[model samples]
Target chain A: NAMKIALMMENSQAAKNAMVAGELNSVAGGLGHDVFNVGMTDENDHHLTYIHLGIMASILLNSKAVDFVVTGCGTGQGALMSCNLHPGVVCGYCLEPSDAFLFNQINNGNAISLAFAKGFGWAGELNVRYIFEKAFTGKRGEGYPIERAAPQQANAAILNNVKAAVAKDVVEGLRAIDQELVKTAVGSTQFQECFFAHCQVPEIAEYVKSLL
Target chain B: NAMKIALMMENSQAAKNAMVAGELNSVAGGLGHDVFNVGMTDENDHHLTYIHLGIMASILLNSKAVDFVVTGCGTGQGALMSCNLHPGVVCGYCLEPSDAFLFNQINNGNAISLAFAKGFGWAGELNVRYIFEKAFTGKRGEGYPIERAAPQQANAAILNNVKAAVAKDVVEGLRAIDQELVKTAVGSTQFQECFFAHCQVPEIAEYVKSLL
Candidate 1:
């Protein structure tokens, strides 16, 4: 299946967004997937923090606007936590293609956070491309190493249940966050266009429109 | 300088704690560091969730009980979020030695969450040992790709500042979390022994004791 992928970068690493987006387009697009280069494309563009990325990703994924999201800050830790703090978003932190491959097969998550600035040098774009390719490859939920696959799959399901128990409902969770934070998260033209155009959930689309 | 490291595991992956702890001990111990295998050492041990890992790590770290922590769940994603959600924690997620090296040099975070189950097949212990070696190997805060080192160092500092701004005071934050959750997090004798024995902050020590 051709996936709809949203590529987001926080302000601190915004300068590299175009390069990262180009790589995403090259690799993901080659697979016939649609790629949306959502801003903060540059420092001059809309100022959204990694915290905002969490809210944005939750909305995008929960509303079915995007099949997957690629996001990151300097270390990928911040973005990883941000994206996962919300309901229905299982984000993996990828430092290399192997992490991407493992997270894809094991977590079968909808989003990934990369370390754009930390070790991203010496053919960094090539590394990003490889990560994208690995992220979308093969049958997901097969777990890692076919031998231990069953147990790993069960653990992933249990973790999701635990997360659901602790988290508030999607819209309820969004309502609790600072309204201003949510506003900026959805303020960008790129975010609005991509999300509204593809959103399949009316309730979420309406709630997001209410923010504007 | 020798360091003190605490190894923690959540219930689901608790069975691997001994193996993981052994790798951490072998590698970190060889470097003249003290290793404490704080439990959920096995499935039958105290049942702690990933959420508790966050609280326990925060207390251990902020109290100056442990200089570093090693924690993970099935995918490492849950533990990564758990540890980072607290104050005084800048966690990195690692799947291999290269990530450990990069995070140590660049993000220079004090804690790391590993993927215990995901992609951990044959030779997983060997990989864990190598990750530890790289994690503690060199002068930290040096940043990766020497040329872009300066900017990466600056961003790590900026991220810390941002986190501090968003987070509540350590004790205050602890108070706000469900009291029962805190109780269970600090319930394990292994956790209590390592924490109270090494805690440098009397206030946090007192607060934790109050929970008991």
Candidate 2:
């Protein structure tokens, strides 16, 4: 199925977002997926942290505006947690093509978090292209061990159940975290424009507008 | 310098931690590092969620039970943040050999959380084995982009300062969260023995002993 994919990065690595988003667009776009570059644009742009990544991605993905998200920081550690902490987003981390392929097959999450800094050297762009290729070109909801596929798929679903059960629902979760933090997260006009222009859910769109 | 490394995985990935930790011990042991397999051995063993993982890891790492730690859940995303949200720990997310090499060299964090549930196919063990090789073999604090080492190192230090300044001290952090959560985390006998035997901080050790 064609998907709407949001590619984002923190300002510390914002300079690479173009390269990262470009490769994602090239790969996902070729698969007939719509790609949205919703993150920071340059080094001097309004600063956004991985913290913002969580709230913003939660807003986009939970509202059904985007079917998938790919985001990261220097190590992808912070961003992965950022994406996962919110409701309705199952974030995976990737540092190589195989990481992409396996995460695509198994956890079958809607979003991926990456490391734009570490190990990005010598043909990094080419490597990223391959990673995106595998991520977007897979049979969705495959299982773990790539064998015992049935049980593993059940376990994957159970995990998402646990995650959703433990976390507050999306709107409540946004309200639960520090308002200042969430405000800063959703405050970026650049992100707001891109997000609201295509955002589909009336509830989330209006709520987010109220926040702004 | 030889280091003491703690290998841990959450319940969702206990079975796989053995595979990940074994390679780490093999490679790091060959180089004279002490390895502690502190996580669950059996998949069906006592369950410790990734939330428990942070509590478990924070105790071990803060008390100086090990010089470094390796941890992960399905995607390495949850555990990485769990480790990072605490004071005095810098956790990086790694997926490949070069990622380990870079996180070691540039970021030089004390721990890494990997995606064990992903990317363990088609020569997967070899990929993990190589990850261990470079992770334990590197000369630390190297930089990327080949031209930004000092700035990167400085920024890494700044990040730690921010974390340290913001997060509560270990014992206080333990108190701030649900006591039951921390109790269950340290409740695992397998975890307790490894933790207490090696744990060095008098204050934390005393508090933990009281809980036991």
Leading candidate by TM-score: 1
TM-score of each: 0.71, 0.68
Chain A TM-scores, one per candidate?
A: 0.96, 0.92
Model 1 per-residue lDDT tens digits across residues B1-212: 67899998998789898898888888889888998888598999989877788778888999999998999887787688667656577788888888788777767778899888868899888889899998877677776677768866765665565344445567876776777778998998899999989999999999998988
Q: What is the TM-score of chain A in candidate 1?
A: 0.96
lDDT of 1 by residue, A1-212 (tens): 67899999998899999899898988999988999988598999999877788788889999999999999988786677667656577888887788887777766778899888877788898889899888877667787677767766765565554344445557766776667878999999999999999999998999999989
B56-164, model 2: which lDDT tens digit per residue? 7778888988888888777775676556556566777777788787777667778888777655566777877887888899588877765778766764664555444
DockQ of every predicted complex: 0.17, 0.14
Write candidate 2's Cα lDDT for A1-212 as tens digits: 78888888887789997888788888889999888877787788777777678778888887887888888888776666556545477787777787777676666778887777666787888988988898888577766566757754654564454345444456765665666666777777766776787788888888787777
lDDT of each: 0.81, 0.74
Could you tell me the lDDT of residue A39 within candidate 1? 59
Give the residue spans of candidate 2 off by over 4 A: A144-147, A161-181, A197-207, B1-5, B9-35, B42-68, B72-91, B95-98, B101-110, B115-188, B195-212
